[PDB]
A paper describes a structure:
The enzyme, termed Hjc_15-6, is encoded in the genome of phage [name]-6, which infects [name]. Amino-acid sequence and structure comparison suggested that the enzyme belongs to a group of enzymes classified as archaeal Holliday junction-resolving enzymes, which are typically divalent metal ion-binding dimers that are able to cleave X-shaped dsDNA–Holliday junctions (Hjs). Activity screening demonstrated that purified recombinant Hjc_15-6 acts as a resolvase, cleaving Holliday-junction oligomers.
Eight Se atoms were found in the asymmetric unit with an occupancy of >25%, and two Hjc_15-6 molecules. Hj-resolving enzymes have so far been reported to function as dimers; however, both the DLS and PISA results in this study suggest that Hjc_15-6 may occur as a dimer of homodimers.
Author numbering:
A (entry chain B): 5 to 28, 38 to 90, 98, 100 to 150
B (entry chain A): 5 to 28, 39 to 85, 98, 100 to 149
Amino acid sequence: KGRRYENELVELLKQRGFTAWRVPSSDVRVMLAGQEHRVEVKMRSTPQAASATRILSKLPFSCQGYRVFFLEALDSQCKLPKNWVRWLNGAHILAVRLPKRFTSPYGGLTGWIIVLPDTLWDAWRSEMS
Amino acid sequence: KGRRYENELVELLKQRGFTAWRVPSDVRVMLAGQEHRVEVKMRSTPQAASATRILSKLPFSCQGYRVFFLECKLPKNWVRWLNGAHILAVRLPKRFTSPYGGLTGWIIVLPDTLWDAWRSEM
């Protein structure tokens, strides 16, 4: 019910050591540096439907103040994809879910792409491991 | 640390049917399907909380806010605490609130827009 992917994202984040939860658009929350952040969740069936076709091979990259990376990626890091700024919808973290069959050949095992502010990248990396 | 009272407020809100939690405005509450920060203040006497004249007037509406025990102009000290946040929860010793009907010791200062959603979550 769309909530399926929000719950999947919350479980993947809790598995990586984050304090994350769901709240009924349907929104997700995450604790970074001791602060709560809204996470917008978008699911698309193909990389073309998510405007990620050219992006997949370029991850992780920093563009327009945002770091764009696969959820499952700690590797060291321009305009941003078409509907992504529109999908952020006032929030500062965006989580895009594609079928794993499309992301896995580029190293995205879970299917998730995270669009995080570059100011939050330090706190994000220091929550894991 | 005053986390003791934030936990007490979260339990009282969950008991009344609300989805409330403390952040690891440290308190959050779900109203109409939206998350709201709740500012928590604990004071030892009604004078320290600017509630002396208020206790007998609850529940009242004042300056766009519905002031009531958890179960006209607002004090300028409450207008500073409620600024930033939207909901303010003031905790006094129950010995002061109980003769006025406040068994728990908590006073909630909620916006008028949120009163509909608050009443429909009980």
